[PDB]
Amino acid sequence: KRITTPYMTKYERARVLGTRALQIAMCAPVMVELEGETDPLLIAMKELKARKIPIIIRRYLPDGSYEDWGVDELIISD
Amino acid sequence: GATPAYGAWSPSVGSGMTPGAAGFSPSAASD
């Protein structure tokens, strides 16, 4: 019974991309094919379109609750 | 790597609509 927006917010998109790009730069396993690029943001962006980012977003509710959302779960905006 | 996952793949089935009659070849035994 998740009640939050099914869409990836611009802020989520920013920090997930940023966060994943950091991990990439730190020699993480990629979850997508590299067609021959080297930028960690470029990679992260690619991964994002593939819905292959190994990240879940813990969204805190004002009452104190929270809802966890996989990256593949929610609707990517841009 | 140059050689990714091959067998981890998802074989997508193809849908169709062919309302044909029944004039095709019969089955056989399994032995």
Binding site: - | A5, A8, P11, V13, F24, A29
Partner: protein
Amino acid sequence: NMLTKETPETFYIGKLIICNVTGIAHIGVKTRLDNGVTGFIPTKFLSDKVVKRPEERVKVGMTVHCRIMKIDIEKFSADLTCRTSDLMIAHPSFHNINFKQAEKMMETMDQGDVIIRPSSKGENHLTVTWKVSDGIYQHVDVRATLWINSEEFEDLDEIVARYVQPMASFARDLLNHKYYQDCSGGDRKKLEELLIKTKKEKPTFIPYFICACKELPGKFLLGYQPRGKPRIEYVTVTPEGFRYRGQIFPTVNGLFRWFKDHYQDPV
């Protein structure tokens, strides 16, 4: 005693004694050893004919580990051996190799022989390449994700005879089919143009064939023309059977006997 730094009783014959032969007197390299023993290289270790240095030494002098063959640290000699030898039907190959150069050695074996090679991406990984067809090979990149244990790596004999040998026996049956082809590797442009040419000679009897891919090995192509439109159905070969519409058949015959009474639906 206690002034020479080393006697001949410490240095023995058979054990490798590193000799520092950094000059040569008149052929061989006369240098110092680790214990201060004046290492005078003999014809069995310094090996210089007066026309050259040792050749197995350096570019600007002599030296190296050698097999100790003389104990003369008090005699200003060192019998250190300059030679490296003086100091001391479904087959299964072994290896330690790249991908491009491995493709040239796996074309000459027959159908069924499985090779063993390290992986290329990642660590502590092994790739199981087994022969499929003429130029078709499935490189089982285990972690084709075939999840295994850690206990099995010491014996490399069962991972093939439980996962690849039955897979090779199931893949060989479709090769010896009565209607098989290659279409130059299983090209998708060459297979749609064959079904439309075989339907004209016999519009009543519809034939079927079977082929595999070259770029996606392990997946077979089961094409059939119920009407004037080509249609392609895929099937995966498994170590326990075949994966066709998600139903696992134990024997190779039950797949065709299940297809002859399933392709007559309108879909």
